[PDB]
Amino acid sequence: YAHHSTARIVMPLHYSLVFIIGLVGNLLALVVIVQNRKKINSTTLYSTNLVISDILFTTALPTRIAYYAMGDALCRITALVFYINTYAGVNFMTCLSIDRFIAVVHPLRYNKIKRIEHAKGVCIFVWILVFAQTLPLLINPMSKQTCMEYPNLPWILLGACFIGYVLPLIIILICYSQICCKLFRARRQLADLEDNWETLNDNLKVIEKADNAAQVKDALTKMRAAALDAQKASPEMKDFRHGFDILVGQIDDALKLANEGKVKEAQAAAEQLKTTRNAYIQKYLERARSTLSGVNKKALNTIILIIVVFVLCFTPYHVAIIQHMIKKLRFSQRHSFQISLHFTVCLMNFNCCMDPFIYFFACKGYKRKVM
């Protein structure tokens, strides 16, 4: 504690800031939750229990803000509330991440599970899981000559670190990769469909302006090769594909005339394609471009916001712990270890006030967040 006089200003500053910011943010959060006290489809329940964890972590804080060098059961309660803050934050962020991944990869399986029963079941499952994560680290009373809770053959450290932090990190990352690939694969698909439509229109134009039927054949074959894989991208998709079936039929009707050698009759039979387009595919291109942005944009920014809150609040502390224990197995103690864990715990508790930043762009009543 060589920097205790420094800490006497550092930690009350940071924890006062965290207390006031997280308290007023979660205050307005649960007020807007009261404003929508029933409609919690699948994500608002995750957000509300994470709010519960954060606000109990804050209501157990005003004892710890009054600190100096200088009970025991109250200190054990502070330890358990810290752990049910951090582990609940991690596991609920990753369950909300897999919720978004299920929603924006298999939406039918999402609507299968969008009901309150299975969602609240998985919620209470990870809630009893985080209650199972905190009690094993509560054996001895931390009082030693305040608490002196900081230090302490240990082997369960990296096991808890892995299960507690490492597995969750890999999950959110693969969920983000799946979301980015699914949103990037229905992107190149729309790009190639627009390219097919553009080459179809350009070759129709060169048909209607060209002579010398040896090139109206060259335009019609490109038009057909475009239509055949434009139709590849249910009772409405059937009427989408029937329009392209009759379009390719008209293409063939023009192409056999071009093969016979009637360049005027071929442009006459190719003229009907714009009529077929306007009657069948113009009213579907707007849907295919606009609807298939919106909910998935909310999902993408929610995943990336969970990733950045993760990698700036739970990564420093846990890599600090794996660094402090990687010193083991090979063999002053308060040099470059106490201030490191001090500031990384400050980050792992700063997640509690960075958590309204999740809601104001992600879920749980963004009305006053926009206001």
């Epitope: 055949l228 894989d229 590849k232 390719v248 063939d252 056999k256």
Partner: antibody, heavy 124, light 109 residues
Framework: EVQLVESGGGLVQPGGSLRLSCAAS????????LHWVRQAPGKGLEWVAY????????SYADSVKGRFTISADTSKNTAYLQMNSLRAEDTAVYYC?????????????????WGQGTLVTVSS | DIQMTQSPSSLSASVGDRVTITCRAS??????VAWYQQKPGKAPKLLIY???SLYSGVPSRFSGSRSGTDFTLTISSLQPEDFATYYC??????????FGQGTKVEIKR
């Protein structure tokens, strides 16, 4: 069962004439377009001509245009290929294929039922 | 007029290998190419149509796929009866049929 049969191959003089006949059984030649794919001895396959007796769309390869004429007498359920003015490089095995009309899976399958092929020999 | 180049003009492999034959189009036909197999002396046989879909009647070791204008036929476990010439036909219109040059899979030794 659908089963194609060719006939009419043999020896001809360079510049002569010949008539191949692709008899069909099972399906009818109205519902399908009958093609002719030939394969020179020791070479790859090449497309020659086709006919679509549902409409009439006799087209030919660039190397046999004006020299071959394809007919389809659907009362006999066969298709014919009249090869006259035969050059020396026209010796091959002439297969007869089958291709369904658009739209749907009959078109998306290519030549799925071929004949056994008849061999012609253009020699002097 | 659409060229169709089939590159590995002769493969050598043994019973149980995994061979792969590729095929590239001049223009950009859609997923309309077919793969054939011609045992010497007989007529061809359809294996793949629509560039990926397996024809009904052939074993499931053959499996084609498509990437742009690069079509490829893969055999997974090369049984001793898969030793023949494999062609590559595009079918975009009736009068625009062009076959590949045909690769001859043969016995490694």
């Amino acid at each position: 069962e659908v089963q194609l049969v060719e006939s009419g191959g043999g020896l001809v003089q360079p510049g002569g004439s010949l008539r191949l006949s692709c008899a069909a059984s099972g399906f009818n030649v109205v519902d399908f377009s009958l093609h002719w794919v030939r394969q020179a001895p020791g070479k790859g396959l090449e497309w020659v001509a086709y006919i679509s007796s549902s409409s009439g769309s006799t087209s030919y390869a660039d190397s046999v245009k004006g020299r071959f004429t394809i007919s389809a007498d659907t009362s006999k359920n066969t298709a014919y290929l009249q090869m006259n003015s035969l050059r020396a490089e026209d010796t091959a095995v002439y297969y007869c294929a089958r291709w369904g009309y658009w739209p749907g899976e009959p078109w998306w399958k290519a030549f799925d039922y071929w004949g056994q092929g008849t061999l012609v020999t253009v020699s002097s | 007029d659409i060229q169709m180049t089939q590159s590995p003009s002769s493969l050598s492999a043994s019973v149980g290998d995994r061979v792969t034959i590729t095929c590239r189009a001049s223009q950009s036909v859609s997923s309309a190419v077919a793969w054939y197999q011609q045992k010497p002396g007989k007529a061809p046989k359809l294996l793949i149509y629509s560039a990926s879909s397996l024809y009904s009647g052939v074993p499931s070791r053959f499996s084609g796929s498509r990437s742009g204008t690069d079509f490829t036929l893969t055999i997974s476990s090369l049984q001793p009866e898969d030793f023949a010439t494999y062609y590559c036909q595009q079918y975009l219109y009736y009068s625009l049929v062009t076959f590949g040059q045909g690769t001859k899979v043969e016995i490694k030794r």
